[PDB]
Amino acid sequence: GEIVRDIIIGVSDGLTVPFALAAGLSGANASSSIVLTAGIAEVAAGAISMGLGGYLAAKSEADNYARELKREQEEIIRVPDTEAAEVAEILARYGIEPHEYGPVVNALRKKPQAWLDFMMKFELGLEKPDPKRALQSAFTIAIAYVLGGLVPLIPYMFIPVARKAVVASVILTLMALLIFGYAKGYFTDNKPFKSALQTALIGAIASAAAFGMAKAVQSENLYFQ
Amino acid sequence: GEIVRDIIIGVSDGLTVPFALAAGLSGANASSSIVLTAGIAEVAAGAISMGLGGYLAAKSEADNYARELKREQEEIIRVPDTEAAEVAEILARYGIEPHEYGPVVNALRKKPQAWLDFMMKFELGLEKPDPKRALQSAFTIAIAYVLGGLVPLIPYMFIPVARKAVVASVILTLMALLIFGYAKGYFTDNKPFKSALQTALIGAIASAAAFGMAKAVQSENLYFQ
Ligand SMILES: [Co+2]
Ligand SMILES: [Zn+2]
Ligand SMILES: [Zn+2]
Ligand SMILES: [Zn+2]
Ligand SMILES: [Zn+2]
Ligand SMILES: [Zn+2]
Ligand SMILES: [Zn+2]
Numbered sequence: 001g002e003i004v005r006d007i008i009i010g011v012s013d014g015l016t017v018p019f020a021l022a023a024g025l026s027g028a029n030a031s032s033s034i035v036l037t038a039g040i041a042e043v044a045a046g047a048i049s050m051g052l053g054g055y056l057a058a059k060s061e062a063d064n065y066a067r068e069l070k071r072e073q074e075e076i077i078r079v080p081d082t083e084a085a086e087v088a089e090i091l092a093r094y095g096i097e098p099h100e101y102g103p104v105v106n107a108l109r110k111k112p113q114a115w116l117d118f119m120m121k122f123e124l125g126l127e128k129p130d131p132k133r134a135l136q137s138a139f140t141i142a143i144a145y146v147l148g149g150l151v152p153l154i155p156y157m158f159i160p161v162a163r164k165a166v167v168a169s170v171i172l173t174l175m176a177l178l179i180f181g182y183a184k185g186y187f188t189d190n191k192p193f194k195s196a197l198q199t200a201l202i203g204a205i206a207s208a209a210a211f212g213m214a215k216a217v218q219s220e221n222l223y224f225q
Numbered sequence: 226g227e228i229v230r231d232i233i234i235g236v237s238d239g240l241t242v243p244f245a246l247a248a249g250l251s252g253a254n255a256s257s258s259i260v261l262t263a264g265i266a267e268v269a270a271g272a273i274s275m276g277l278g279g280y281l282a283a284k285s286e287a288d289n290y291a292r293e294l295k296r297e298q299e300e301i302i303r304v305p306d307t308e309a310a311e312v313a314e315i316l317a318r319y320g321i322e323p324h325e326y327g328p329v330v331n332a333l334r335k336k337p338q339a340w341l342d343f344m345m346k347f348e349l350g351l352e353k354p355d356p357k358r359a360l361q362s363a364f365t366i367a368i369a370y371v372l373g374g375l376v377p378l379i380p381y382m383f384i385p386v387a388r389k390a391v392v393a394s395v396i397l398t399l400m401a402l403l404i405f406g407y408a409k410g411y412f413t414d415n416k417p418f419k420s421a422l423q424t425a426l427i428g429a430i431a432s433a434a435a436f437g438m439a440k441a442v443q444s445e446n447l448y449f450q
Binding site for chain 2: 009012013016017020021024025028030031033034036037038040041042043044045046047048049050052053056057060063064067068094095096097099100103104107111114117118121122125126188189190198202205206207209210211212213214217218221224225
């Protein structure tokens with residue numbers, strides 16, 4: 001689930017922080033337009049950091065694994081037996097009788113591709129990356145982040161009073177958390193009814209955190225300024 | 226690099242968005258205290274979503290892989306040969322001569338632990354998770370996020386004028402991006418001089434995005450309100 005995981009980690013970040021930041025700013029008697037200006041500035045700034053962060057990790061792991069793929073094939077050139085010795089240990093660790101693993105290395109020495117592929121598959125994990133899924137990763141997380149952050153900001157666009165709009169945003173995102181919480185469970189091995197309530201509580205813990213932090217800095221101001 | 230990856234993905238998120246959100250709010254002639262109230266509300270709301278998001282994924286993957294570990298051992302009980310057939314394909318795909326893979330399954334049938342461990346190691350990846358590193362993951366990403374978001378907000382705490390404080394925050398975080406950009410390269414296979422400039426440009430793209438988004442909503446207001 002490459003593209004399924006990318007759109008899940010992107011919506012959970014964009015549903016919780018922009019909603020929490022909005023609710024916290026609305027709690028401190030800020031104008032609804034001000035709540036929108038910091039939310040959208042967060043949503044835009046958030047999608048780029050999530051997006052390029054998903055592209056930096058994907059493009060770094062894709063370049064490294066392909067370089068180690070080349071670094072390991074050059075090792076079997078200079079000292080072939082040392083590379084054979086490393087692949088022999090892989091077989092040996094899993095309890096193979098010596099009269100059966102011996103002919104395996106002899107066949108592996110003639111054809112390099114299969115021996116290295118399995119050895120690398122058994123030593124450094126599945127490290128051959130899809131070139132199109134590296135950039136597909138970044139566009140899917142940035143889309144899911146923008147979509148997630150837009151949901152808590154919709155009511156502030158139609159309600160110019162923030163203390164009135166935050167009530168529409170609490171129930172709308174709470175519904176969004178429970179819906180996209182049970183969605184992450186229908187496409188996961190866990191129970192979707194458990195993932196719905198968990199995505200709504202992380203939105204509650206974060207919205208409460210941003211609320212308490214918003215009011216502790218406004219503790220000395222008479223109005224929001 | 227379990228704990229090394231957790232503190233990298235956490236600082237890159239917390240260095241870019243709180244800085245960008247702050248710079249965008251400061252650009253629209255907002256009070257420096259207002260910039261702090263939305264930044265810290267974002268930093269707090271951001272660390273919880275990053276933290277519990279790292280704990281939800283870790284605790285879901287740890288529970289699922291252990292359940293599939295149990296689901297697969299019960300499969301070798303009802304129809305042992307079907308489970309043998311699945312492990313036989315693993316060997317067969319990598320070009321094994323038939324006179325050598327045959328005795329391997331016979332030895333694998335007597336002792337279940339090694340046969341399933343390798344088969345699972347070769348089929349469903351390395352899926353046995355450390356119990357202490359699942360919760361260690363969440364505390365390390367939340368720490369790195371808070372630390373990252375605090376850096377762009379320090380100057381606004383000592384400079385009550387935002388248009389004056391944003392200049393101190395641009396060079397301070399840009400330095401932070403270049404420092405923690407070359408830090409992610411000294412502990413990665415890529416060149417650290419390349420990762421420094423890349424973490425500073427993602428901070429530039431995001432800070433510019435939040436700036437343009439902050440001013441497009443304030444396009445009709447005479448002062449920031
Ligand atoms: Co984030
Ligand atoms: Zn090597
Ligand atoms: Zn080797
Ligand atoms: Zn080697
Ligand atoms: Zn199975
Ligand atoms: Zn099987
Ligand atoms: Zn099976």
